[PDB]
Amino acid sequence: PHELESQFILRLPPEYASTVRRAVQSGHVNLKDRLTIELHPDGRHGIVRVDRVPLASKLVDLPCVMESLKTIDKKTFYKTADICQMLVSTEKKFIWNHGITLPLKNVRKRRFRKTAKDVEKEVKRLLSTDAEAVSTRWEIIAED
Amino acid sequence: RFSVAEHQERYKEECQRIFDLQNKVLSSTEVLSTDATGRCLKIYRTFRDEEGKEYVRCETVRKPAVIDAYVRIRTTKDEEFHREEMRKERRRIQEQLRRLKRNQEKEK
């Protein structure tokens, strides 16, 4: 079978980003030894090791949706993957408010329309507790 | 009292203005600085502990989002009056088949 590839964006500190960029544009396999990525079983924490120097990482959710688009002639572009996550290196904490481009900053707060009426999972847990019970008493309340 | 060119031109100009504001804001390379009832829900739960006990838990939900989803199920389950029903249907099919086999025996 075929499994859709999973692309994400890696953001590094600027000096380490310059060393990683120089090693990528060089093209040797020396970069392979220099750059490693260890993702912790939390799922939202990691180490990126640049030149064997550990950096602390967080996998965050991006507010917009990006899409990688490949081309052969630079006139027709084929969508290859959807990017929604970034492993910035240096829950509410795992949500990034800004977008990658310069015009998109504070997009989640300002350029996103918010419509409102985790919570569903809590309601399911409450229903399960009511089922495991015997007698349930309920009242919409006031200030108390 | 225009009902024709006025509405059409007004819509057209608002369209050009929005198109031109969006183009400018998006292509900007300027850096942007980082920046009804008022009623809660309370539930009382009765359970039996190991050995013999009958403790009762009173839990208050102050999240109006949890409230809405919670209540909507009860109101639905209150009007909803199933694995047990499926078992009953299998016990009906079992009886019908036996009756059919009795009918076959009567015919033969």
Strand A53-71, strand A77-89: pairing: antiparallel
Q: Can you say whether residue A51 is alpha, beta or left, with left for phi > 0 and alpha for psi between -120 and 50 degrees?
A: left
In the block, tokens 């229903």 appear at A127
Question: Exposure string (b/e) for A78-90, b if CB count within 10 Å is 16 or more?
Answer: eeeeebbbbbbbe
Amino acid in the structure at residue B91: R
- Chain B positions in Cβ-Cβ contact with residue A135 (cut-off 8 Å): 44-46, 56
Reduce the DSSP state of residue A32 to 3 states and report it: helix
Is residue A64 within 8 Å of residue A107, measured between CB atoms?
Answer: yes
Is residue B84 within 8 Å of residue B65, measured between CB atoms?
Answer: no
For chain A, the straight-line distance linking the first and the last C-alpha, in angstroms and rounded, comes to: 59
For this experimental structure, what is the resolution in angstroms?
Answer: 8.6
Reduce the DSSP state of residue A94 to 3 states and report it: coil
Q: For residue A57, give how far its alpha carbon lies from the nearest alpha carbon of chain B (Å).
A: 21
Task: List Cβ neighbours of A9 (8 Å cut-off, separation of 6 or more).
Answer: A62, A66, A83, A85, A86, A87, A100
Q: In what order do the strands lie in the sheet with A53-71?
A: A9-11, A77-89, A53-71, A46-50, A35-39
Rounded to whole angstroms, how far apart are CA atoms A60 and A44?
7
- What's the distance, CA B24 to chain centroid? 40
Interface test mutation site (partner B, options A98, A104, A123, A130, max chain B beta carbons within 10 A): A123
For residue A135, what are its two tokens? 């007698």
Number of other residues whose CB lies within 10 A of the CB of residue A48: 24
Interface test mutation site (partner B, options A110, A111, A137, A144, max chain B beta carbons within 10 A): A137
Pick from A35, A98, A83, A89: nearest CA to A59? A89
Q: For residue A3, give how far its alpha carbon lies from the nearest alpha carbon of chain B (Å).
A: 34
Its sign, for the CA torsion B55, B60, B65, B67, is positive
Pick from A109, A111, A128, A132: nearest CA to A120? A128
Give strand pairing partners of A38: A47
Pick from B67, B47, B65: nearest CA to B56? B47
Question: Exposure string (b/e) for A58-77, b if CB count within 10 Å is 16 or more?
Answer: bbbebbbebeeeeeeeeeee
CA separation, residue A60 to residues A92, A144, B14, B32, B34 (Å): 10, 39, 38, 21, 17
DSSP state of A100: S
Does B31 touch chain A if contact means CB atoms closer than 8 Å? yes
Give strand pairing partners of B63: none
Does B100 touch chain A if contact means CB atoms closer than 8 Å? no
Radius of gyration, CA atoms only, chain A:
22
Is residue A102 within 8 Å of residue B32, measured between CB atoms?
Answer: yes
Task: Name the experimental technique.
Answer: cryo-EM
